[PDB]
């Protein structure tokens with residue numbers, strides 16, 4: 038199909054789709070809009086939200102729903118039905134935490150305090166659960182990389198902007214990051230993508 | 236298989252799974268715990284959250300990942316891969332909303348004003364988007380029922396506890412609720428189930 042991805046010029050919630058197109062070596066239009074474009078772009082969305090992905094003229098929405106669609110019947114999915122369920126569960130566990138953050142808070146001082154509290158008081162319990170889940174295994178699910186490893190790398194990249202020592206007690210979680218980042222199609226995307234804070 | 240669901244004695248995040256089991260005619264242990272048992276059980280879960288579902292002695296977690304695992308290869312999944320993406324997308328849109336609500340929050344007026352914010356300003360936008368998305372079709376996705384229809388019924392039920400006028404301008408959304416509640420195995424489950432607030 039012809040693919041058009043619509044999002045801000047940010048990594049954010051589109052980045053998981055971008056990694057999956059990179060890894061799978063699929064061409065697509067990476068359409069990055071400006072704030073000034075938002076009211077106009079918005080009036081065309083089913084639920085007022087981006088990313089969307091248009092596929093031969095038809096609109097998909099919800100970044101995780103899209104990422105799952107793109108990975109079906111590929112090596113990124115999970116080998117078995119049970120591993121597929123595990124892939125989904127780890128992705129939702131990550132997404133639930135990213136969704137706690139007050140991304141749209143106007144007052145900067147209140148936004149900053151709350152980010153600092155989540156990262157200091159809540160994040161270490163999640164990092165420890167993830168570490169323990171991972172064990173000495175090479176990848177989070179099964180024997181080869183899945184889009185849950187991608188998403189771990191993506192989410193921890195953004196958290197590390199706000200909490201640099203996030204992973205100081207979890208060197209196995211750093212290794213996993215580095216393995217995701219050394220996959221050649223993915224290294225290539227990381228090197229060439231627009232550099233944005235988020 | 237041998238299925239055991241563990242959740243609180245509420246509909247909450249487990250209800251989607253109970254509707255799936257009911258509709259597919261699958262027997263399972265509906266294990267409901269007490270606040271007082273939680274601290275003890277919690278410390279044994281991979282990520283310290285419920286619901287969990289144990290399948291022949293194996294532990295799955297995350298309610299929507301489990302819901303997807305159970306519906307795969309059934310007529311509750313959509314009929315094409317694109318249609319399965321629209322089912323996951325509707326569910327995520329509804330889950331994103333329900334998740335915005337500060338369920339555990341223990342200050343009655345930060346909680347009580349947040350509920351009013353989402354219920355007064357956000358809800359009507361969502362109800363309007365869903366209605367436009369449905370149009371005059373029978374079901375949200377495709378030509379028959381999917382678990383996105385189940386999630387809408389479940390979500391709108393709890394929303395109606397906090398905002399009984401929610402669906403006043405949206406009679407078609409009410410007709411969808413009733414198409415679902417009319418399905419015999421679902422009807423059977425609704426009368427049979429523990430009566431809880433949430």
Ligand SMILES: Nc1c(S(=O)(=O)O)cc(Nc2ccc(S(N)(=O)=O)cc2)c2c1C(=O)c1ccccc1C2=O
Nearest residue numbers: 047048049050086135136140141191192195235331
């Ligand atoms: N940057 C953002 C921003 S924001 O532009 O700064 O506002 C927002 C944001 N969430 C968000 C989710 C739902 C809503 S809604 N419509 O109310 O339901 C609004 C914002 C995320 C990110 C991420 O960067 C990100 C990175 C990795 C995983 C998840 C997220 C991520 O969830």
Ligand SMILES: N[C@@H](CCC(=O)N[C@@H](CS)C(=O)NCC(=O)O)C(=O)O
Nearest residue numbers: 133247248283284285286297298299
């Ligand atoms: N998105 C997850 C949410 C998991 C979750 O945070 N569940 C709550 C109850 S609805 C829980 O187990 N938390 C209680 C606690 O951690 O003390 C799911 O649907 O399974």
Ligand SMILES: [Ca+2]
Nearest residue numbers: 129132133327
């Ligand atoms: Ca989510």
